[PDB]
Amino acid sequence: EVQLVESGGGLVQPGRSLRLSCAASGFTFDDYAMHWVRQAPGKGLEWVSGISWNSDSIDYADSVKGRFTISRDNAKNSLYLQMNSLRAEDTALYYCAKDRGYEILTPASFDYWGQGTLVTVSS
Amino acid sequence: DIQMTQSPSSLSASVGDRVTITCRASQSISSYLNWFQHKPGKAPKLLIYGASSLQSGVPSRFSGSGSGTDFTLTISSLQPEDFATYYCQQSYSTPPYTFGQGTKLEIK
Amino acid sequence: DIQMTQSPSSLSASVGDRVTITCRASQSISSYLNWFQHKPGKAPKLLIYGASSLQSGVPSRFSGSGSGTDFTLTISSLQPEDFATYYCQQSYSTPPYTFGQGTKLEIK
Amino acid sequence: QCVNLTTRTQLPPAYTNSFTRGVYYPDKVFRSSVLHSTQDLFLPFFSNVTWFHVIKRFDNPVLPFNDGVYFASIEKSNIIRGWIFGTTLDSKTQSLLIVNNATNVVIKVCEFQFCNDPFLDMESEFRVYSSANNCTFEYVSQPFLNFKNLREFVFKNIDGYFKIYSKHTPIDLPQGFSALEPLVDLPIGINITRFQTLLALHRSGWTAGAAAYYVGYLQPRTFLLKYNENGTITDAVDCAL
Amino acid sequence: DPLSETKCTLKSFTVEKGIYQTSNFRVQPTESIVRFPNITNLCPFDEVFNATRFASVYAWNRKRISNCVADYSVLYNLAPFFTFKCYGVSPTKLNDLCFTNVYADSFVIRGDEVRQIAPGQTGNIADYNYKLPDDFTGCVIAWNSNKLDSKVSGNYNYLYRLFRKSNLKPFERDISTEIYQAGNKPCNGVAGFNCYFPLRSYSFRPTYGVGHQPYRVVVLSFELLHAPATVCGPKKSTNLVKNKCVNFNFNGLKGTGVLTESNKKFLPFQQFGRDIADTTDAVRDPQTLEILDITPCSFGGVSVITPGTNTSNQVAVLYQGVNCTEV
Amino acid sequence: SNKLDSKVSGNYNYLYRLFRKSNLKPFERDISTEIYQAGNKPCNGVAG
Ligand SMILES: *[C@@H]1O[C@H](CO)[C@@H](O)[C@H](O)[C@H]1NC(C)=O
Ligand SMILES: *[C@@H]1O[C@H](CO)[C@@H](O)[C@H](O)[C@H]1NC(C)=O
Ligand SMILES: *[C@@H]1O[C@H](CO)[C@@H](O)[C@H](O)[C@H]1NC(C)=O
């Protein structure tokens, strides 16, 4: 019943930067871990990044290391993702899934998911 | 590294049949695998967390089992609202939250 | 562990005397000690089981007492066949049935 | 925060007649058209009941609890706000607090450090205690609330249980009969021997509206209660009057 | 038959002509009804057991529970809670026996230290982290938390006190970070030679065996004081049956009779009703605010009309004060 | 009889019944080893 609203999607040229916002209101956000994952238009799901309940332990996907950064605002119960140095392969769908646990690297997986937002990287 | 394989890709059945899907791992993950159902029209949702723990709020028709390398999910009722794609994800090995290939399920 | 000490080793008395022998323990054993009489020429025999319980068939002259860490046996009559070696044994500590050193008794 | 009041005008407390007030339902039993004899802690007919006025009369004295207290208030515009019970009224012992602010009715059991002159002062200045150390019981209850209101209360403490009986009537003490309906049962389990009332001052320094209340002490006696056919007590007879 | 009943009553083999009173006709109940008010105001055990993050074992979390109904069957009905050891009280009778206050102690331990949470036990946790009294009245629960408290890089958020100058008292929490004095020389706050920090970190990982996986432990210590106990279990309520001679339990009140709809209007506070003869005749249902009359199950006195047995053996039966439709 | 029935390692020759569905009748001997059921789900022969 929890709500996960995502925005920031659109069409941008390769090499530009943008922001994605994911806001949650149906649960307590101060003690849950959150993750960004990627579903390709013609392939399966892939994990991208995630943050814990507090901004101490942080992880990124190997294919996106050094390019993407995440931020978390517990005051307004939301998180942001900065899209930098975009290339032709980043035109997929992105979800904002909620981890069952509190840390970043735990055997507990994502509990509740949100509707994906479509981004396009082309001229 | 870790490698995941999906033996079935597309399957055919009816309303009153029984279907089984399997997911195999290159190395044993101590039964730390999760199953996700992804409707084409909405956001994906989890069905089974862990080896054989059913997530509360979904029908008990889905059943997860298997430990070690190969794991199995089973549907006994096949309700006409089960048109989605099933994914298996491991959460034990060093590659963080790597997902497997899709598994198309349809009835004919 | 546990260590049992015999304060007297050889004692001299007459046929009409009263003698006492003491056995000390390293720590408390909760009155779980036994007193054995060992004739040099035959099989040893038990005199006292428990702290102050007299075994059946032996004369009431012998009397045991004491609890905690120290224990005592007393003979009031000293009949002329009371020449033997007396031992104190504990049966409470982890070392199973450890015996103390001998206590020679002579009449003079 | 505590503030001492030095604007009091010294007058002795008044005395008036209790008449036939202070009767309440002894238990939870329904009786119809039956006269029943009950031995309980009651208020005798036609005695001293002590009378205090508030208007610069500021009657906030500290009275013994004894075996039970009958507190009547001839009131309008919500001047009386709560009560304080305990033995030493300090953090040394356990104290009980009943308040009804502008929002709701609050019951607390804590080691309050009560002010020498605690009160309430829109009403947004509460000077009742400076600290609360050990709180063992909390309770939120519904709001209990020409002089127009007559509010009668009976407070009793038996076997660690605090019983509060209440009655509201639209109107010296008026002459009439009214059974007090039981309101609150509280499992507190504390020793209570003394008490103090809590008033509200209107700030314009401060002005106090016209108010008057009465205090009586209960003792064990036997009454004969008459129940009508509706199960409502209509009359009582004091067997020892 | 009534003639033989008369012979039994009169202690004679011959019955003279006349009418004799022998015994009574009473209907027997068949169903038993037990009633209590709605099971609301549940104790917040979800915040204790289903909490996302527990505190460390040295700083074990203590929660006081009172003034609510505690459903111990919920904890008894969850499969993942493998370890349920209770001492001083039977687990089956936890539901009925009423106590004053509950203390929930939550912490995290390893495998070899699970057994140390018990009266009379010893170890690092028993001596320096969490001490259990010998006369402990309560239960302990331990469950695996490898999926939550383990990280591939390692979870260092849990700590345990490994060194202390003395053993902890029962139900004592030590959170001091003073440097342990292991040598003669004063430490002076520096963990140098013969000086060690008393707290060590549990580096939980998902690749550990059963003896090293992180396990969440909640200990319920149960106390009853002179104050009226307020922690009760859920009281089951039997479905209401009416219009028949039944056994009823109304708020601890035993009774036997026919329950019928009543026209009396009980006052909101009024609970029980008594008739002229000082007997319970009306009751208010604890769940639905309705009034019910309790009539005694049909009463009759049986009299026998018979001529002398020298004449004939035929008899007649008279039920006193009973309408002919109630036999 | 602490001298005879006590082992320093521990004696286990003596057992007592802890759970039963009903109280025993006077002078009744119960040697049944069936698994006591306190939940709704039947045991089905497992002490789980
Ligand atoms: C109240 O007691 C006083 C004495 O303190 C007495 O003078 C007075 O008569 C009593 N009240 C009534 C109504 O009699
Ligand atoms: C009792 O109640 C009935 C109806 O509710 C009413 O007619 C009657 O007047 C009541 N009795 C009294 C004394 O008010
Ligand atoms: C108890 O629950 C029933 C329905 O299950 C409801 O009818 C009843 O009103 C409840 N009790 C109270 C006091 O509301």
Any idea which residue has 């994990």 for tokens? Answer: A47
Residue B5 CA, distance from chain mean position: 12
How many C-beta atoms lie closer than 10 Å to residue E178's C-beta? 12
What are the distances in angstroms from CA E248 to CA B6, D30, E298? 62, 19, 17
E54 bridge partner residues: none
Pairing relation of β-strands D105-110 and D137-141? antiparallel
| Ligand 3 pocket mutation, candidates E36, E38, E42, E237, criterion most atoms within 8 A of CB | E38
What are the distances in angstroms from CA E161 to CA E36, E111, E203, E218? 48, 17, 14, 18
Cβ–ligand 1 contact at D17 (below 6 Å):
yes
CATH, residue A46 = 2.60.40.10
Residue B90 and residue B1: Cα distance in Å, rounded?
12
- Residues in C closer than 8 angstroms to F8, CB to CB, are 92-94, 96
Q: What is the 3-state secondary structure (H, E, C) of D3-62?
A: CCCCCCCCCCCEEEECCCCCCECCCCEECCCCEEEEEEEECCCCCEEEEEEECCCECCCC
Q: What is the 3-state secondary structure (H, E, C) of chain E?
A: CHHHHHHHHHCCCCCCCEEEEEEEEECCCCCEEEECCCCCCECCCHHHHCCCCCCCCCCCEEEEECCCECCHHHHHCCCCCCEEEEECCCCHHHCCCCECEEEEEEEEECCCCCCCCCCCCCCHHHHHHCCCCCCCCEEEEEEECHHHHCCCCCECCCEEECCCCCCCCCCCCCCCCCCEECCCCCCCCCCCCCEECCEEECCECCCCCCCCCCEEEEEEEEECCCCCCCEECCCCCCCCCCCCEEEEEECCEEEEEEEEECCCCCCCCCCEEECCCCCEEEEECCCCCCEEEEECCCEEEEEEEECCCCCCCCCEEEEECCCCCCC
Atom of ligand 1 nearest to the CA of D48: 1
The reply to whether A6 touches chain B by the CB within 8 Å rule is no
Per the CB < 8 A criterion, the answer to whether A24 and A78 are in contact is yes
Touching subunits for chain B (3+ Cβ pairs under 8 A): A, E
- Show the CA angle centred on residue B32, arms to residues B28 and B38, nearest 5°: 115
Asked if A100 and E152 come within 8 Å (Cβ–Cβ), the reply is no
- Which residue, E123, E113, E88, is CA-closest to E220? E88
C25 bridge partner residues: C4
Both structure tokens of B17: 């049949």
What are the distances in angstroms from CA E162 to CA D13, E130, E142? 68, 12, 21
Alpha-carbon torsion angle A104, A106, A111, A112, nearest 10: 10
How many helices and strands in chain D, by DSSP H and E?
A: 0, 21
Per the CB < 8 A criterion, the answer to whether A84 and A9 are in contact is no
C-alpha radius of gyration, chain A, whole number? 14
Helix (H, G, I), strand (E, B) or coil at B11: strand
C-alpha radius of gyration, chain E, whole number? 34
Q: Is the dihedral of CA E221, E223, E228, E234 positive or negative?
A: positive
C36 bridge partner residues: C46, C87
Residue E197 and residue E156: Cα distance in Å, rounded?
15
CATH, residue C91 = 2.60.40.10
Touching subunits for chain D (3+ Cβ pairs under 8 A): E
Asked if E228 and D34 come within 8 Å (Cβ–Cβ), the reply is no
The reply to whether B31 touches chain E by the CB within 8 Å rule is no
The reply to whether F38 touches chain E by the CB within 8 Å rule is yes
Residue E139 and residue E153: Cα distance in Å, rounded?
34
Any idea which residue has 């028949």 for tokens? Answer: E244
Residue A89 and residue A107: Cα distance in Å, rounded?
29
**3+ Cβ–Cβ pairs closer than 8 Å linking B and A:** yes
- Residues in A closer than 8 angstroms to B56, CB to CB, are none
Both structure tokens of D183: 């309101």
Both structure tokens of A76: 């307004």
Q: Is the dihedral of CA D84, D88, D91, D96 positive or negative?
A: negative
Phi, psi dihedrals of residue E149, rounded to the nearest 5°: -100, 10
D138 bridge partner residues: D108
Residue D190 CA, distance from chain mean position: 18
- Which residue, E86, E38, E73, E81, is CA-closest to E222? E86
Q: What is the count of structural domains for chain A?
A: 1
Which residues contact residue E93 at a Cβ distance below 8 angstroms, ignoring those fewer than 6 apart?
none
- Best mutation target, D30, D109, D159, to test chain E (most E CBs within 10 A): D30
What are the distances in angstroms from CA B74 to CA B17, B64, C101? 11, 7, 75
Please report how many Cα atoms fall inside a 13 Å half-sphere around the Cα of residue A73, on the Cβ side: 12
Per the entry, the structure determination technique was: cryo-EM
Per the CB < 8 A criterion, the answer to whether E48 and E218 are in contact is yes
What one-character DSSP code corresponds to residue D89? S
Could you tell me the end-to-end alpha-carbon distance of chain A, in angstroms, rounded to an integer?
39
Residue F37 and residue F48: Cα distance in Å, rounded?
10
Which residues contact residue C1 at a Cβ distance below 8 angstroms, ignoring those fewer than 6 apart?
C26, C93, C94, C95
Pairing relation of β-strands B104-105 and B10-11? parallel
Residue D34 and residue E18: Cα distance in Å, rounded?
42
Residue C96 and residue C90: Cα distance in Å, rounded?
8
Residue E287 and residue E235: Cα distance in Å, rounded?
12
Per the CB < 8 A criterion, the answer to whether D181 and D166 are in contact is yes
Residue C71 and residue C28: Cα distance in Å, rounded?
11
Per the CB < 8 A criterion, the answer to whether D26 and D219 are in contact is no
Per the CB < 8 A criterion, the answer to whether D63 and D214 are in contact is no
Residue E199 CA, distance from chain mean position: 39
Both structure tokens of D101: 């602010």
Q: What is the 3-state secondary structure (H, E, C) of D106-143?
A: EEEEECEEEEEEEEECCCCCEEEEEEECCCCEEEEECC
Asked if F8 and C92 come within 8 Å (Cβ–Cβ), the reply is yes
Resolution (A): 3.7
Please report how many Cα atoms fall inside a 13 Å half-sphere around the Cα of residue E22, on the Cβ side: 24
Residue E261 and residue E259: Cα distance in Å, rounded?
7
Asked if B92 and E147 come within 8 Å (Cβ–Cβ), the reply is no
Atom of ligand 2 nearest to the CA of D228: 13
E290 bridge partner residues: none
Per the CB < 8 A criterion, the answer to whether B104 and B63 are in contact is no
By CB atoms closer than 10 A (0-12, 13-18, 19+), residue E146 is buried
Residue B73 and residue E127: Cα distance in Å, rounded?
47
Which residues constitute the domain of residue A64? Answer: 4-121
Residue E132 and residue D94: Cα distance in Å, rounded?
30
D184 bridge partner residues: D164
- Which residue, A96, A89, A78, A95, is CA-closest to A122? A89
Pairing relation of β-strands D68-75 and D211-217? antiparallel
Residue D13 and residue C30: Cα distance in Å, rounded?
73
What one-character DSSP code corresponds to residue D200? B
C107 bridge partner residues: C13
Cβ–ligand 1 contact at D50 (below 6 Å):
no
Per-residue buried b or exposed e for B89-100, using 16+ beta carbons within 10 Å of the residue's own CB: bbbbbebbbbbb
- Which residue, D31, B81, D106, is CA-closest to E278? D31
The reply to whether E152 touches chain B by the CB within 8 Å rule is yes
Residue E198 and residue E177: Cα distance in Å, rounded?
7
Both structure tokens of B13: 């059945």
Which residues constitute the domain of residue C86? Answer: 4-107
The reply to whether F15 touches chain E by the CB within 8 Å rule is no
Helix (H, G, I), strand (E, B) or coil at D184: strand
Residue B44 and residue A117: Cα distance in Å, rounded?
13
Q: Is the dihedral of CA B47, B53, B55, B58 positive or negative?
A: positive
What are the distances in angstroms from CA F9 to CA C81, C96, D85, E121, F6? 40, 11, 59, 15, 9
Any idea which residue has 């981890």 for tokens? Answer: A99
Asked if F3 and C32 come within 8 Å (Cβ–Cβ), the reply is yes
What are the distances in angstroms from CA E135 to CA C19, E96, E101? 46, 21, 17
What are the distances in angstroms from CA A36 to CA D211, D217, E163? 66, 71, 43
- Residues in A closer than 8 angstroms to B32, CB to CB, are 107
What are the distances in angstroms from CA D71 to CA D94, D166, E225, E308? 22, 10, 32, 76
Residue E90 and residue E69: Cα distance in Å, rounded?
19
- Which residue, D232, D172, D146, is CA-closest to D19? D172
Per-residue buried b or exposed e for D189-228, using 16+ beta carbons within 10 Å of the residue's own CB: bbebeebbbbbbbeeeeeebeebbbbbbbbeebebebebe
Residue E322 and residue E171: Cα distance in Å, rounded?
68
Phi, psi dihedrals of residue C37, rounded to the nearest 5°: -110, 130
Q: How many CB pairs under 8 A join B and E?
A: 11
Domain spans in chain D, listed from the N-terminal domain onward = 14-241
Asked if E76 and F19 come within 8 Å (Cβ–Cβ), the reply is no
Asked if F3 and C92 come within 8 Å (Cβ–Cβ), the reply is no
Which residues contact residue D201 at a Cβ distance below 8 angstroms, ignoring those fewer than 6 apart?
D119, D120, D121, D207, D208
Both structure tokens of D228: 């009508």
The reply to whether E251 touches chain D by the CB within 8 Å rule is no
Any idea which residue has 């687990």 for tokens? Answer: E91
Could you tell me the end-to-end alpha-carbon distance of chain F, in angstroms, rounded to an integer?
35
What are the distances in angstroms from CA D13 to CA B13, D56, E52? 93, 14, 61
Residue E191 and residue E201: Cα distance in Å, rounded?
16
Q: Which residue type occupies E283?
A: V
Domain D14-241 has CATH 2.60.120.960: yes
Q: What is the count of structural domains for chain C?
A: 1
- Which residue, D29, A23, D239, B92, is CA-closest to E280? D29
- Residues in F closer than 8 angstroms to C94, CB to CB, are 8
Both structure tokens of E246: 């039944």
Any idea which residue has 């038959």 for tokens? Answer: E1
- Residues in B closer than 8 angstroms to A35, CB to CB, are 97
How many C-beta atoms lie closer than 10 Å to residue E62's C-beta? 14
| Nearest CA, atom 2, ligand 3 | E38
Per the CB < 8 A criterion, the answer to whether E321 and E301 are in contact is yes
Indicate the residue of D25, D30, D189 with minimum beta-carbon distance to E274.
D30
- Residues in B closer than 8 angstroms to E147, CB to CB, are 32, 50, 91
Both structure tokens of B1: 């590294």
| Nearest CA, atom 13, ligand 3 | E287
A60 bridge partner residues: A49
Residue E271 and residue E257: Cα distance in Å, rounded?
18
Longest CA span, chain D: 56
Q: Which ligand is nearest to the CA of D16?
A: 1
